[PDB]
């Protein structure tokens, strides 16, 4: 019973996260987010046992662990017309889209710390067999007191595979040119493209491309002062041909990525 195990509060974010409600687990007063998904709106289905569940539940369960870089699924329920997902809710929180809107372009030291944490989170997903497919600032929560970032919203994700993907329901302005042009992509190199968009977003204050023509055009204009090392990493992630993009290892060994702050240092210097 969900209504007995949790005190359900008001809608979170007025629907901007979907049907996500504030909640508190009665057993130990743990803050939770209660996310409702309609069965009729579910694209991909998975199996858990023979239990047929939304793929989002499958992916969330596979990344659920002590690693704090991804949102933690605590439990889920099936209803006649929907599934209900119980997520551990950090507090206080602001998502990275709103953070950047309010702060503008981030100092590179702060962008480096945030980007590093996202890289570690995406590596965790991939190590667990999960491809997120919707990496963007809207899908990143900042724990403002701990300086820890959390990847959220696995509703566009897929099991990670090495063969080609021909479907996609993530965010188009973060999707790579081979998807725009050919409706085909491989998971890791597409993820690296979206991370280039995200890094540009952090250091310039908004994403670089709004239109298909800009995505495929292969030109990156910098609207803010950005170091040559950071520009190089961004341009490398945004290589037009997927095989020209860096691996996750090459990104984290890049000179711009060295000497990252710890999460607690990040919170004390930039967030408190």
């Amino acid at each position: 019973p969900l209504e007995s195990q949790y005190q359900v509060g008001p809608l979170l974010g007025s629907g901007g996260f979907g049907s996500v409600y504030s909640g508190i687990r009665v057993s130990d007063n743990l803050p939770v987010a209660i996310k409702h998904v309609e069965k009729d709106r579910i694209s991909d289905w998975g199996e858990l046992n023979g239990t047929r569940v939304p793929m989002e539940v499958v992916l969330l369960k596979k990344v659920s662990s002590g690693f704090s870089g991804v949102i933690r699924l605590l439990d889920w329920f099936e209803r006649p017309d929907s599934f209900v997902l119980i997520l551990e809710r950090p507090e206080p929180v602001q998502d990275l889209f709103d953070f950047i809107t309010e702060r503008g372009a981030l100092q590179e030291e702060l962008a480096r710390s945030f980007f590093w944490q996202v890289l570690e989170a995406v590596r965790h997903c991939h190590n667990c067999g999960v491809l997120h497919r919707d990496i963007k600032d809207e899908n990143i929560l900042i724990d403002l007191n701990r300086g820890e970032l959390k990847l959220i919203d696995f509703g566009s994700g897929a099991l990670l595979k090495d063969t080609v993907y021909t479907d996609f329901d993530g965010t188009r302005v973060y999707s790579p040119p081979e998807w725009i042009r050919y409706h085909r992509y491989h998971g890791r190199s597409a993820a690296v493209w979206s991370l280039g968009i995200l890094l540009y977003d952090m250091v310039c204050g908004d994403i670089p491309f709004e239109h298909d023509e800009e995505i495929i055009g292969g030109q990156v204009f910098f609207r803010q002062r950005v170091s040559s090392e950071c520009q190089h990493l961004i341009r490398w992630c945004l290589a037009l041909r997927p095989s020209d993009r860096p691996t996750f290892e090459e990104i984290q060994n890049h000179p711009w990525m060295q000497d990252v702050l710890l999460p607690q240092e990040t919170a004390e210097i930039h967030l408190h």
Binding site: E138, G155, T171, R172, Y174
Partner: peptide, 8 residues
């Protein structure tokens, strides 16, 4: 310049 969210 207009910064906006983008739906998935």
């Amino acid at each position: 310049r207009k910064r906006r969210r983008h739906p998935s």
